Design a protein around this ligand. Structure first.
Ligand SMILES: [Br-]
Ligand SMILES: [Br-]
Ligand SMILES: [Br-]
Length: 231
């Protein structure tokens, strides 16, 4: 049978993203809007910096900007923590360590407000080099494909996640961003605690030719894998 969480994602769902950020004292806010289609693992989102110029590169915020929209194959449905926590939601905590630079700490509350799936985020960045790849804006406006590794954390009724992002630097090198995370339900009800598996991501970044504010358009596809002889 289809669980209450799953049922909320059977069609296209509007998304609202709100972020308040402070990186080495540079304060900024971002709002985003778009839609998610969990059946296809598809996210289409446009983000605006509402405070002026974004003080870090857009690609460094991609991982922060709704894993409930991942496509879980039917055979892996019992491993979909994110949908099982809905509609009450879940809290994602991350630390993102930029190699030879600073770190972000993020807290995101992901929950429904009516028909809208909301991702409300606080981001704090410290210890950045004012002339490094992040504050010095040396990252290319593009994005590579990565796997995100998920394991159960029974003690916390949630999951622990880790992965490495490689951001292309303008000189042909790479800036590593090591992500460590936990996701835990907001509500007190049962959730699905998964076996080890991963999410496979691909992301494309673009610009709206009619948009004069600092912004990012994101197209992202996310599919669960790692757990699989009928043939
Ligand atoms: Br950028
Ligand atoms: Br891209
Ligand atoms: Br995560």
């Amino acid at each position: 049978m289809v669980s209450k969480g799953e049922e909320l994602f059977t069609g296209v769902v509007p998304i609202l993203v709100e972020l308040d950020g402070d990186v080495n004292g540079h304060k900024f806010s971002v709002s985003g809007e778009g839609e998610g289609d969990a059946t296809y693992g598809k996210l289409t989102l446009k983000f605006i910096c509402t405070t002026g110029k974004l003080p870090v590169p857009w690609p460094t915020l991609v991982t922060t900007f709704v894993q409930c929209f991942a496509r879980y194959p039917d055979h892996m449905r019992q491993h979909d923590f994110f949908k099982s926590a809905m509609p009450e939601g879940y809290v994602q905590e991350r630390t993102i360590f930029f190699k030879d630079d600073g770190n972000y700490k993020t807290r995101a509350e992901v929950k429904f407000e009516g028909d809208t799936l909301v991702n409300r985020i606080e981001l704090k960045g410290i210890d950045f080099k004012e002339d490094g790849n992040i504050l010095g804006h040396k990252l290319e406006y593009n994005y590579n494909s990565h796997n995100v590794y998920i394991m159960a954390d029974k003690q916390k009724n949630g999951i622990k996640v880790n992965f490495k992002i490689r951001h292309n630097i303008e000189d042909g090198s790479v800036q590593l961003a090591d992500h460590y995370a936990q996701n835990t339900p907001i509500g007190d009800g049962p959730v699905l605690l998964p076996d080890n598996h991963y999410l496979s991501y691909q992301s494309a970044l673009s610009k709206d030719p009619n948009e004069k504010r600092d912004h990012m358009v994101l197209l992202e596809f996310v599919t669960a894998a790692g757990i699989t002889e009928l043939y």
